[PDB]
């Protein structure tokens, strides 16, 4: 099924606009992947107290 | 056996590999959270069954 | 097996190629985008919770 979709000669309106959303998510993951660390370092500080 | 790759297919693979890496990052960040939560429920459990 | 049969024969029309500019995502590509959206919102809530 993955090979039967690879031979398509042009990008659609939906392939190009999913690509906009997928280009936005990494910087939200950069904030969430600091928020997890801030909550871990909160737990580390509370547990040691 | 008989095709030349096109610029759309290059740009499609670069889009699906961005979704793969985002999915494989999110499913880690969801387990990082699950381990943090399991270590939050298990700290509350006193491991002596002699207590009345 | 039968999705793979139909898509193999669909890819052999010359008219179909002309409509691909206006195709939505395939249901697997959008199901992965909906899972990425679901996981992003979950990882965002469980950070606050």
Swiss-Prot record, chain A:
Tissue: Ubiquitous.
Compartment annotation: Nucleus, Nuclear pore complex
Assembly and oligomerization: Interacts with NUP214/CAN. Interacts with NUP62 and NUP98.
Function: Component of nuclear pore complex.
Disorder: Fetal akinesia deformation sequence 4: A clinically and genetically heterogeneous group of disorders with congenital malformations related to impaired fetal movement. Clinical features include fetal akinesia, intrauterine growth retardation, polyhydramnios, arthrogryposis, pulmonary hypoplasia, craniofacial abnormalities, and cryptorchidism. FADS4 inheritance is autosomal recessive.
Protein name, per record: Nuclear pore complex protein Nup88
Species this protein is from: Homo sapiens (Human)
Encoding gene per record: NUP88
Parent-protein start and end of this portion: 644 to 692 of 741
Curated annotation (Swiss-Prot), chain B:
Residues linked to a glycan: 50
Post-translational modification: O-glycosylated. Contains about 10 N-acetylglucosamine side chain sites predicted for the entire protein, among which only one in the C-terminal. The inner channel of the NPC has a different redox environment from the cytoplasm and allows the formation of interchain disulfide bonds between some nucleoporins, the significant increase of these linkages upon oxidative stress reduces the permeability of the NPC.
Source species, domain of life: Eukaryota
Subcellular location: Nucleus, Nuclear pore complex; Cytoplasm, Cytoskeleton, Spindle pole; Nucleus envelope; Cytoplasm, Cytoskeleton, Microtubule organizing center, Centrosome
Family of this protein: Belongs to the nucleoporin NSP1/NUP62 family.
Disease cited in the entry: Infantile striatonigral degeneration: Neurological disorder characterized by symmetrical degeneration of the caudate nucleus, putamen, and occasionally the globus pallidus, with little involvement of the rest of the brain. The clinical features include developmental regression, choreoathetosis, dystonia, spasticity, dysphagia, failure to thrive, nystagmus, optic atrophy, and intellectual disability.
Function description: Essential component of the nuclear pore complex. The N-terminal is probably involved in nucleocytoplasmic transport. The C-terminal is involved in protein-protein interaction probably via coiled-coil formation, promotes its association with centrosomes and may function in anchorage of p62 to the pore complex. Plays a role in mitotic cell cycle progression by regulating centrosome segregation, centriole maturation and spindle orientation. It might be involved in protein recruitment to the centrosome after nuclear breakdown.
Domain observations: Contains FG repeats.
Protein name: Nuclear pore glycoprotein p62
Full-protein residues shown: 419 to 470 of 522
Curated annotation (Swiss-Prot), chain C:
Record comment regarding domains: Contains FG repeats. FG repeats are interaction sites for karyopherins (importins, exportins) and form probably an affinity gradient, guiding the transport proteins unidirectionally with their cargo through the NPC. FG repeat regions are highly flexible and lack ordered secondary structure. The overall conservation of FG repeats regarding exact sequence, spacing, and repeat unit length is limited. The beta-propeller contains long interblade connector loops, and mediates interaction with DDX19B.
Subcellular location: Nucleus, Nuclear pore complex
Quaternary structure note: Homodimer. Part of the nuclear pore complex (NPC). Interacts with NUP88. Interacts with ZFP36; this interaction increases upon lipopolysaccharide (LPS) stimulation. Interacts with DDX19. Interacts with XPO1. Interacts with XPO5.
Disease: A chromosomal aberration involving NUP214 is found in a subset of acute myeloid leukemia (AML); also known as acute non-lymphocytic leukemia. Translocation t(6;9)(p23;q34) with DEK. It results in the formation of a DEK-CAN fusion gene. A chromosomal aberration involving NUP214 is found in some cases of acute undifferentiated leukemia (AUL). Translocation t(6;9)(q21;q34.1) with SET.
Parent-protein residues present: 779 to 827 of 2090
Modifications made to the protein after synthesis: Probably glycosylated as it reacts with wheat germ agglutinin (WGA).
Organism phylogeny: Eukaryota, Metazoa, Chordata, Craniata, Vertebrata
Domain of life: Eukaryota
Annotated protein name in UniProt: Nuclear pore complex protein Nup214
Function: Part of the nuclear pore complex. Has a critical role in nucleocytoplasmic transport. May serve as a docking site in the receptor-mediated import of substrates across the nuclear pore complex.
Residues of the site described as Breakpoint: 34-35
Tissue expression: Expressed in thymus, spleen, bone marrow, kidney, brain and testis, but hardly in all other tissues or in whole embryos during development.
């Amino acid at each position: 099924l993955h090979s039967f979709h690879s031979e398509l000669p042009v990008l659609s309106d939906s392939e190009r606009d999913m690509k906009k959303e997928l280009q936005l998510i990494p910087d939200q993951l950069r904030h969430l992947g600091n928020a997890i660390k801030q909550v871990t370092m909160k737990k580390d500080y509370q547990q040691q107290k | 056996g008989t095709i030349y790759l096109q610029h759309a297919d290059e740009e499609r693979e670069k889009t699906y590999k961005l979704a793969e890496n985002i999915d494989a990052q999110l499913k880690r960040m969801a387990q990082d959270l699950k381990d943090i939560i399991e270590h939050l429920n298990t700290s509350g459990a006193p491991a002596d069954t002699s207590d009345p | 097996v039968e999705e793979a049969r139909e898509q193999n024969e669909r890819n052999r029309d010359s008219g179909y190629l002309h409509l691909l500019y206006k195709r939505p995502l395939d249901p697997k590509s959008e199901a992965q985008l909906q899972e990425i959206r679901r996981l992003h919102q979950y990882v965002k809530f469980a950070v606050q919770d």
